[PDB]
């Protein structure tokens, strides 16, 4: 079972106890530290409170962010009675209810990001029974259960950051890879950091942001020179 | 203002306004308080030589009223659409 | 029984007759718990919720039954 909690004690004793690091320095560090064999993940582990409401906490999904770059994804814009007819004028991407309808019901899919109005969305990104991915899968939520379609296509075309686990009040968001550049990464954090302050209007504690921490794997992680706080949005 | 043990009629009505406080520092001066222009220049702090106007002024509007036919100033004073209409027609500064 | 659960409170019917001012709404016949026993007709659309004669814009009561039989017909003819 548990032999000795020694290998983890010496390691955590190095770089965690809220040792606040330059965001960029952290990333520089992040690729290796203890013998983790290949370049790893950049994560932010954000701790949010409570149960009974979420705004972007335990999301089996992806939301649009300032600085969407990091990845770009496949996108189809489903335009049915909604802010679709504004999307038809917009003419960005491909907009069409009944042809994209077919394409949805065909047998095969690849347009991961369904910007959607009513019919398409249910198919792609949610389905299965005991759903869950090969390691990654077409995801459902993309804020088109908060439908807008035209402006949505601009945001959509650009890309998008997926994060997911289950049910804990602490919202983890995987910031990116280390095959993405250090300063672009910083910007990913800052973007999510601005969003979160935004998030949650429903009082349960008036500062909902505890730890902005940045971490990788193999007992390797650090804290951020916290800069998410309430003052406006920073 | 009573009515025995039949219920207060105003306790048979609700409350509903709301104060401004800004309000008390918003004064209301007239067109014919350019009669008291006392200097060719309409300036808030000259109109206190008239004492026509608040001690703790922070705001004021100039409203209609009779005419005086003279150059005026008006800066930092609000002036109404109708109010400014004829004191424009007497010459005088009046841009704000 | 032994009861005396009472109090009456609808009131009002047939206010005025014939020339009635003339007015955009008349009471005409607001005439209650009925729809016929003062039957609608003339210068006025609809039989009100409680059955109202209330002008088309104006009206003296014209009254007076019609059809081959039937009703008693209250009619409104403009003032």
């Amino acid at each position: 079972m548990a032999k000795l909690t020694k290998r983890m004690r010496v390691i955590r004793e190095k770089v965690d106890a809220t040792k606040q690091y330059d965001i960029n320095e952290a990333i520089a560090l992040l690729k290796e530290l203890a013998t983790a064999k290949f370049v790893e993940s950049v994560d932010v582990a954000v701790n949010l409170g409570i149960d009974a409401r979420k705004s972007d906490q335990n999301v089996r999904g992806a939301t649009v962010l300032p600085h969407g770059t990091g990845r770009s994804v496949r996108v189809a814009v489903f335009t049915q009675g909604a802010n679709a007819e504004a999307a038809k004028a917009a003419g960005a991407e491909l907009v069409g209810m009944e042809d994209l309808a077919d394409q949805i019901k065909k047998g095969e899919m690849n347009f991961d990001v369904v910007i959607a109005s009513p019919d398409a969305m249910r198919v792609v990104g949610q389905l299965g029974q005991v759903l869950g991915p090969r390691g990654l899968m077409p995801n459902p939520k993309v804020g088109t259960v908060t439908p807008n379609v035209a402006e949505a296509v601009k945001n959509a075309k650009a890309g998008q950051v997926r994060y997911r686990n289950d049910k804990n009040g602490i919202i983890h968001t995987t910031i990116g890879k280390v095959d993405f550049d250090a300063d672009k990464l910083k910007e990913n954090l800052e973007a999510l950091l601005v969003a979160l302050k935004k998030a949650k209007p429903t009082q349960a504690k008036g500062v909902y942001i505890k730890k902005v921490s940045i971490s990788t794997t193999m007992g390797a992680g650090v804290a951020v020179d916290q800069a998410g706080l309430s003052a406006s949005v920073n | 203002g009573f009515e025995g043990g039949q219920m207060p009629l105003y306790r048979r009505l609700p409350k509903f306004g709301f104060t401004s406080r800004k309000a008390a520092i918003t004064a209301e001066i007239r067109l014919s308080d350019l009669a008291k222009v006392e200097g060719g220049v309409v300036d808030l702090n000259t109109l206190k030589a008239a004492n026509i106007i608040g001690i703790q002024i922070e705001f004021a509007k100039v409203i209609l009223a009779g005419e005086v036919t003279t150059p005026v100033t008006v800066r930092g004073l609000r002036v109404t659409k109708g109010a400014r209409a004829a004191i424009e027609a007497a010459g005088g500064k009046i841009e704000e | 029984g032994g009861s005396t659960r009472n109090g009456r409170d609808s009131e009002a019917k047939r206010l005025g007759v014939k020339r009635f001012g003339g007015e955009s709404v008349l009471a005409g016949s607001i005439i209650v718990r009925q729809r016929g026993t003062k039957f609608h007709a003339g210068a006025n659309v609809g039989c009100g919720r409680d059955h109202t004669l209330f002008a088309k814009a104006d009206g003296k009561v014209k009254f007076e039954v019609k059809g081959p039989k039937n009703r008693k017909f209250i009619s409104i003819e403009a003032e």
């Binding site: 149960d51 969305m121 249910r122 049910k167 | - | -």
Partner: protein
């Protein structure tokens, strides 16, 4: 053997609201069914109470079909998703409905919901009227293919009993015993009343109630925001009885509220049997003979019968079952103008009907206006010509000359002769 809609949708909320709107049958009470056309079927109803998880878990496995519920303002909720998953694995069919559907025409259903490991979410009605029709039809069709289970003698009804007492004692636990001797939990709720309330349930046909507000071991689906609603229930407990049981403790019983509670019982006009529960841990010189004596002197002519049980031992268990039956026989006793008139004569001769304003009154027969709580109406002189006291004196006499281990008996007086 037989289907049950079996509402779930997270532990609480409007979940109940929907059952009342699907039911209409009270006093069958709980279990309990929702009727549609010909066929009627039952209905059944983080970090939540351990007891409340155990009942709910108990409900869904016997459950035969299930209904999982979402609100208008509710959407997303991983906990709901877990409950939904549990249901799939264990294997019974589930339909996904959404409570007081609202929105602004069907929109956000079905879109979130496909991830729910369930597909088509039907939106409902309960405060409008179209949205109930689809659900009832869906269930109907398989259920139509099938066709599953759907003086008057003392034995014409099975004996009705409640278990009332303090807002302290773990009465609900004593309730679990009374229903048990099987060593099994039983306070699994189903829903069949108008609104969110409450268990009377029957075993052996005969009805038991659990009542008051907290400490009772009322930790339920919730419905009494204040101290008040619960009382609305105990008054139900009165309606349903011909027997009530008062649990009192020997270490928090006879509180001020409680002695009032017994005083109330007298109004309640239903048979009193007095229970003392969790009484194996009390001190060897009991406190408590005197506690019995103060209640005795108030005084309750009935048959007592004191019980000293625990819900965590059981001693009194048989003696309670027995006492209620004996009490019911006396209470429900076949009566009859003859008996009453004959014993009465003795009484008035012996101790003297009251005189009023130099005119002596006159009694002249009694008859029974019903027996179950025994009422008599005696036609004599005027209402004020007796004091309530003499009424009671003559009543007490009858209570004496023919056994009434049962409830207080009632006497009336009518006038016509004067």
């Amino acid at each position: 053997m037989v289907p049950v809609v079996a509402l779930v949708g997270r532990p609480n909320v409007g979940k109940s609201t929907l059952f009342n709107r699907l039911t209409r049958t009270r006093d069958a009470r709980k279990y309990g069914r929702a009727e549609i056309e010909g066929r009627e079927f039952i209905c059944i109803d983080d970090g939540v109470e351990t007891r409340m998880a155990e009942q709910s878990l108990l409900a869904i496995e016997e459950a035969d079909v299930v209904l999982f519920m979402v609100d208008a303002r509710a959407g997303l909720m991983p906990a709901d998703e877990a409950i939904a998953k549990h249901l799939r694995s264990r294997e019974k069919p589930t339909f996904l409905v959404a409570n007081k559907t609202d929105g602004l025409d069907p929109d956000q259903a079905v879109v979130d919901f496909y991830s729910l490991g369930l597909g088509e979410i039907y939106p409902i009605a309960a405060s409008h009227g179209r949205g109930v029709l689809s659900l009832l039809e869906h269930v109907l069709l398989p259920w139509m293919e099938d066709l599953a289970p759907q003086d008057f003698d003392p034995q014409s009804l099975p004996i009705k009993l409640a278990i009332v007492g303090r807002p302290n004692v773990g009465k609900s636990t004593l309730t679990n015993r009374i229903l048990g001797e099987e060593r099994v939990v039983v306070y699994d709720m189903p829903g069949t009343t108008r609104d969110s309330i409450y268990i009377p349930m029957e075993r052996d046909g005969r009805e038991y109630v659990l009542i008051d507000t907290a400490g009772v071991r009322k930790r339920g689906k919730i419905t009494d925001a204040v101290e008040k609603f619960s009382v609305i229930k105990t008054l139900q407990a009165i309606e349903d009885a011909n027997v009530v049981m008062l649990v009192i403790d020997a270490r928090e019983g006879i509180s001020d509220q409680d002695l009032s509670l017994l005083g109330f019982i007298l109004n309640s006009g239903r048979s009193l049997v007095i229970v003392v529960n969790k009484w194996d841990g009390l001190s060897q010189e009991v406190k408590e003979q005197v506690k019995e004596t103060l209640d005795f002197r108030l005084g309750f002519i009935d048959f007592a019968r004191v019980h000293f049980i625990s819900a965590l031992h059981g001693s009194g268990v048989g003696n309670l079952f027995e006492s209620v039956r004996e009490a019911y026989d006396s209470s429900t006793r076949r009566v009859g103008t003859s008996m009453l008139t004959r014993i009465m004569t003795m009484a008035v001769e012996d101790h003297q009907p009251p005189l009023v304003r130099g005119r002596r009154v006159k009694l002249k027969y009694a008859h029974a206006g019903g027996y179950n709580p025994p009422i008599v109406v005696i036609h004599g002189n005027q209402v004020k010509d007796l004091p309530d006291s003499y009424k009671r004196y003559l009543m007490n006499y009858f209570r004496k000359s023919l056994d009434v281990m049962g409830s207080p008996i009632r006497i009336q007086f009518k006038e016509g002769e004067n």
